[PDB]
RNA sequence: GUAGCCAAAUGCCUCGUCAUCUAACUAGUGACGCGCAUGAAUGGAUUAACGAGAUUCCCACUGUCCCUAUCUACUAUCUAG
RNA sequence: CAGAUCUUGGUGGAAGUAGCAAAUAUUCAAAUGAGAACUUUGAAGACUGAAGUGGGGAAAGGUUCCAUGUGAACAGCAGUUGGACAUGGGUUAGUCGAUCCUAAGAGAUAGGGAAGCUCCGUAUGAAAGUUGCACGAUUUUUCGUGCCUCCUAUCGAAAGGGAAUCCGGUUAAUAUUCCGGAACCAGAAGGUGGAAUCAACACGGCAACGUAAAUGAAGUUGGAGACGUCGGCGGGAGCCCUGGGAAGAGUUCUCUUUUCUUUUUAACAAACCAUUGAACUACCCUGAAAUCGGUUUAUCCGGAGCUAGGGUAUGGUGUUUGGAAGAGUUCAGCGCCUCAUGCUGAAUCCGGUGCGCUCUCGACGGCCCUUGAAAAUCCAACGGAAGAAUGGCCUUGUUUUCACAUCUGGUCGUACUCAUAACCGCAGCAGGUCUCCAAGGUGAACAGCCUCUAGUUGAUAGAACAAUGUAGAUAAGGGAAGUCGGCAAAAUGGAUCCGUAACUUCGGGAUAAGGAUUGGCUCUAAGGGUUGGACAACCAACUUAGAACUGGUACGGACAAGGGGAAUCUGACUGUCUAAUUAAAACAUAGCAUUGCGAUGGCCAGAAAGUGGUGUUGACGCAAUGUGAUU
């Protein structure tokens, strides 16, 4: 598992071809984790905002598979 | 309290049977079998451990990038900094003495 | 305080082995554990490592010296060196 | 011991197989005296000796 | 029971089975006292209450079992400072 | 009777314990450089050799014919130190640690690890504190006379090499062992020769000294030189016996 | 047969003789020594410390004894197998 | 055949006898059943008491494992039950082992012995060659000679060396192997991306050294693998203990803001990092120290450059995170034949502690006539082989020791027991058999004693209380009169404070001897840390000494736990042996002495040998004897 600290970095990994799916995890503390499954690693980005989470979810590639936990 | 068992069939406290205790996300106390500790390369002239290089088992060194296994200097990763400095000064002074002894031989 | 009038380091042996034997061991043990002076560096950091081998501490002169079993130099070795030096200096000239 | 060689394991399989009752129709044959056998080995009683 | 023992009950001579050394190693007491005195000496030097010349004399005195506790050291420092300033006042006058 | 203990020391459990030994202590193969000139080596290590009183010196020499360095194992002479230069050959100087033909050194010099035959790589005066003395040369048909640690006088060819100085490790035997356990540890790294049961403590089947209703030998313990194995026990071919009062 | 040592784990005679301890000792210890047959690395003498070694005694202690008694458990005993 | 302690087989009296008594212990109800002291369930009473009657392994066994049945034989009583019997089922790996490596050793080959079976030998008296170069070879590459160079059989470790896996779940029965999720290693090809190179293979930093990459052939050199033991000191992890909150439970005449349980976080990845715990540990720079300073529990360090100031490296079982709450745990409800056993809510939080325990790491100290494997394998350097981009730019090689991606990882083992019933001992035998984890109280303590988790309640039973036993207690007065002899037993015993003879090798003797004290409660004094403006309100603490009061004139209240002294013989001491009648004064030992021998040798071996040991040796040595520390 690897953590991604930049939204720009996370979007670039998603646009890659190995990026199969994404996961949305909503924690009790109103923080949102975006998890990207590549061949070798699972990449998590922690978004501490609901507004930012919505924009990031809309910022994803349209063909990316985003799954809700 | 919770007591543990070896996870392998090796039943003896040998140096290849090193363990440490982990507490798991199931609230289980159990062993984790671990390796012997690494060793830093040592200077070929003085035996001192060489700076800038991690302590690893011998084959783990095959996985590092080149610059992690050496120092950017002559004999880097093979001689210490002070050993190299002795070699440079010694080589120069000895060569100069060979020059004067050749000059005074004629 | 003194803690011992005679046996010194040999007090570890207690009353065993005989007084003469403990006294002979005492003289040698004081020698073999003494600090001696390094002629190459001038420090008194010369201690024995196994019977004829005398080592030095510090960053300088990490050399090892071949010496006597219980002292750094023996009288026989010292006398031999001067004998050898005299013989060397008489065929030289 | 559960640490065992293949050759040992093959022998154990064979030993277990010979350690079975004879089917009755074998002893029902005309002219057969296979009614009882002295080859019923048991693990605690008679040892294999490799 | 442990609460009572905290207040000092159940700890008389009839309640001890180990030696005093078995109960409380004297080497631990000494190590604690030395670490306490050395920390005090270091604090005083860092604040300028004592200078390195007095610190060195007191350090070797503390190693030699001169002060039973922090108080004995503090009174001794106060006595030493009072005497030194007296010589300074004598000389400066 | 049965095979006595001395007859069983032919191998097996009586072999030397050699796992902890780093190499035999040898002079260096007599080569062109040593025959005609000298060659320089540097002392790399001075090390303890289990089962040997004297320390050993690992000395690095350049190979004259190939790009490579050859490490030699010498018996350290007293005074030797790591980083010292040692010189071996006919033209080497008369300094402690150098290796020279005995014919090239004056009468009276103190030497060690001396060859019996030129090139045997060291036989005489090798144990701790021991040495050999040069007694004289006979230039016609070059033979050098030397005195050995036993006191014997020997004639070696004046091409046999020797090391200048005395073997290091000093007066080791001056210290009482004081304890069975210390003798145990001394011979543990040597061979299976300790402790020793006395012959008279045995039965007649075990030893010629065995048996009897008191512990005694019976016949004389000075036995002839030509005794068979199994009867060659006690004081073999003794010229004399008893406490000597003044010898030579 | 020197220095030593001894009726000694070595003395037959022998329960040697004298002294000591005991009410009383063929014990023990100390002396003595023409020692059947002690004695010098076939090691003599001495010896602190150590000893599940041998030997004599004293204090403590006590059913070892005077002189036996009492109590518990398991047997023995009777029953089924 | 009457005999032979005759042979083989069968069968008697002894006899319903000896006996089936070690390891504290069983009881009530129910179910099942023809039948229950022995099966199963519930309840009670107990035990092992973490150096286990607990949880695993190595060796050995080999199916004993699991389910369903059975109950002739076996389970020295019983049997509805069983490790018995019958029918079926059960062991899943690139990451755990083996496999690879070498060790003591084994052992082909050369060669030599031997009538021969075979013996010696292991680069050995051998033409004992896998590896290093492109000279041909189109043309973008491993087949022909070449000149070359100190290479090498193999076997030998399920505890040594060694590439790589963790958590949660799952079965009647396997699991680091299956499932879910999350990783890692090795090899191959080169699939993209990036980096350097306009002529060549990067920059930064005074330096220690740093980075996302940063060309490097032969040869050489260096490193890792790779190493004893004891002692204390410092840190970490798990455990232990403690203060609150929460959820559930136990108790509740009275009391108890109570008592108990749960309150978890892996491999791997990233960034920091002496902060918060553990460094001035090592090194570098500035600077130049006597009024010498620094400094550890332990006295080492400095003009060969101290103190100080600032840096560099080493880096997790530390921190902050990803993994990861979605898992696990605890609790509360809903459908209610319910089905795929689904669905819905809460909590899983915040603090502290250490001469503690187990493991581990770090820096050290002591000791040795003792100085404490090897090899496979991996890495680094020194060196400079080789390369071909060029038309000021659309144009190659390298790097895959930089990132992401692809393929592949065979074969054998894997159930279960590991022992008062799975092994050996004729057996389900009070014997024997290597090792890992290890809670609370008391206490010095892994002692004894009690308890929690776990396990077990299994050792034929019932009744009775005769003699004589075995095991365990007590005894008036006397106190060794007993006896070969204090044999056996008694007495002593912990700790604190007093006190302690001869003799002595000066170390000891010594816990000599010989005295006193010891509970509970209520206080007093002294001894250390965090922390607010000469000081200080808490919090976090543990000792030691003393006083008063008090009661069974008691208190190491059980448990635990020396009797002591005066002498003689003898062996100096620690050590060793007659497995199963001898443990000693016997043996050994240090010490002392003597003997042989300088290698064409001494001692020992072999049938022989081009053979072996001492010998990786050399008189401060090897070999052969005697005596037995010292004096
Ligand atoms: Mg005998
Ligand atoms: Mg004979
Ligand atoms: Mg007498
Ligand atoms: Mg004599
Ligand atoms: Mg009877
Ligand atoms: Mg008949
Ligand atoms: Mg007849
Ligand atoms: Mg008959
Ligand atoms: Mg009966
Ligand atoms: Mg008990
Ligand atoms: Mg109990
Ligand atoms: Mg089990
Ligand atoms: Mg069966
Ligand atoms: Mg493995
Ligand atoms: Mg192998
Ligand atoms: Mg299982
Ligand atoms: Mg298993
Ligand atoms: Mg068996
Ligand atoms: Mg009485
Ligand atoms: Mg009475
Ligand atoms: Mg009395
Ligand atoms: Mg009497
Ligand atoms: Mg009588
Ligand atoms: Mg007794
Ligand atoms: Mg003895
Ligand atoms: Mg016996
Ligand atoms: Mg016996
Ligand atoms: Mg003896
Ligand atoms: Mg003597
Ligand atoms: Zn020096």
Swiss-Prot record, chain A:
InterPro entries: Ribosomal_eL38, Ribosomal_eL38_sf. Its main location: cytoplasm. Transmembrane segments: none annotated. It comes from the Eukaryota. Keywords: Cytoplasm, Ribonucleoprotein, Ribosomal protein. The keyword Ribonucleoprotein applies. One of its GO terms (cellular component) is cytosol. One of its GO terms (biological process) is cytoplasmic translation. Pfam families: Ribosomal_L38e. The keyword Ion transport does not apply. GO terms for molecular function: structural constituent of ribosome. There are 2 genes for eL38 in S.pombe. Belongs to the eukaryotic ribosomal protein eL38 family. Component of the large ribosomal subunit (LSU). Mature yeast ribosomes consist of a small (40S) and a large (60S) subunit. The 40S small subunit contains 1 molecule of ribosomal RNA (18S rRNA) and at least 33 different proteins. The large 60S subunit contains 3 rRNA molecules (25S, 5.8S and 5S rRNA) and at least 46 different proteins. Component of the ribosome, a large ribonucleoprotein complex responsible for the synthesis of proteins in the cell. The small ribosomal subunit (SSU) binds messenger RNAs (mRNAs) and translates the encoded message by selecting cognate aminoacyl-transfer RNA (tRNA) molecules. The large subunit (LSU) contains the ribosomal catalytic site termed the peptidyl transferase center (PTC), which catalyzes the formation of peptide bonds, thereby polymerizing the amino acids delivered by tRNAs into a polypeptide chain. This is Large ribosomal subunit protein eL38A.
From Swiss-Prot, chain D:
Component of the large ribosomal subunit (LSU). Mature yeast ribosomes consist of a small (40S) and a large (60S) subunit. The 40S small subunit contains 1 molecule of ribosomal RNA (18S rRNA) and at least 33 different proteins. The large 60S subunit contains 3 rRNA molecules (25S, 5.8S and 5S rRNA) and at least 46 different proteins. eL39 interacts with yih1. GO terms for cellular component: cytosolic large ribosomal subunit; preribosome. The gene is rpl39. This is Large ribosomal subunit protein eL39. It comes from Schizosaccharomyces pombe (strain 972 / ATCC 24843) (Fission yeast). Keywords: Cytoplasm, Ribonucleoprotein, Ribosomal protein. One of its GO terms (molecular function) is structural constituent of ribosome. Component of the ribosome, a large ribonucleoprotein complex responsible for the synthesis of proteins in the cell. The small ribosomal subunit (SSU) binds messenger RNAs (mRNAs) and translates the encoded message by selecting cognate aminoacyl-transfer RNA (tRNA) molecules. The large subunit (LSU) contains the ribosomal catalytic site termed the peptidyl transferase center (PTC), which catalyzes the formation of peptide bonds, thereby polymerizing the amino acids delivered by tRNAs into a polypeptide chain. Belongs to the eukaryotic ribosomal protein eL39 family. Its main location: cytoplasm.
UniProtKB/Swiss-Prot annotation, chain E:
Component of the large ribosomal subunit (LSU). Mature yeast ribosomes consist of a small (40S) and a large (60S) subunit. The 40S small subunit contains 1 molecule of ribosomal RNA (18S rRNA) and at least 33 different proteins. The large 60S subunit contains 3 rRNA molecules (25S, 5.8S and 5S rRNA) and at least 46 different proteins. eL19 lies in close proximity to the binding site for eukaryotic initiation factor eIF4G. There are 2 genes for eL19 in S.pombe. This is Large ribosomal subunit protein eL19B. Component of the ribosome, a large ribonucleoprotein complex responsible for the synthesis of proteins in the cell. The small ribosomal subunit (SSU) binds messenger RNAs (mRNAs) and translates the encoded message by selecting cognate aminoacyl-transfer RNA (tRNA) molecules. The large subunit (LSU) contains the ribosomal catalytic site termed the peptidyl transferase center (PTC), which catalyzes the formation of peptide bonds, thereby polymerizing the amino acids delivered by tRNAs into a polypeptide chain. It comes from Schizosaccharomyces pombe (strain 972 / ATCC 24843) (Fission yeast). Belongs to the eukaryotic ribosomal protein eL19 family. It is found in: Cytoplasm. One of its GO terms (biological process) is cytoplasmic translation. The lineage of its organism: Eukaryota, Fungi, Dikarya, Ascomycota, Taphrinomycotina. It comes from the Eukaryota. The chain holds residues 66 to 158 of 193 of the full protein.
Curated annotation (Swiss-Prot), chain F:
Keywords: Cytoplasm, Nucleus, Ribonucleoprotein, Ribosomal protein, RNA-binding, rRNA-binding. PROSITE patterns: RIBOSOMAL_L2. The keyword RNA-binding applies. Pfam families: Ribosomal_L2, Ribosomal_L2_C. One of its GO terms (biological process) is cytoplasmic translation. It is found in: Cytoplasm; Nucleus. Gene3D superfamilies: 2.30.30.30, Nucleic acid-binding proteins, Ribosomal protein L2, domain 3. InterPro entries: NA-bd_OB-fold, Rib_uL2_dom2, Ribosomal_uL2, Ribosomal_uL2_C, Ribosomal_uL2_CS, Ribosomal_uL2_dom3, Ribosomal_uL2_RNA-bd_dom, Translation_prot_SH3-like_sf. Its main location: cytoplasm. SMART domains: Ribosomal_L2, Ribosomal_L2_C. It comes from the Eukaryota. The keyword Cytoplasm applies. GO terms for molecular function: RNA binding; rRNA binding; structural constituent of ribosome. One of its GO terms (cellular component) is cytosolic large ribosomal subunit. There are 3 genes for uL2 in S.pombe. Component of the large ribosomal subunit (LSU). Mature yeast ribosomes consist of a small (40S) and a large (60S) subunit. The 40S small subunit contains 1 molecule of ribosomal RNA (18S rRNA) and at least 33 different proteins. The large 60S subunit contains 3 rRNA molecules (25S, 5.8S and 5S rRNA) and at least 46 different proteins. Belongs to the universal ribosomal protein uL2 family. This is Large ribosomal subunit protein uL2C. The gene is rpl803.
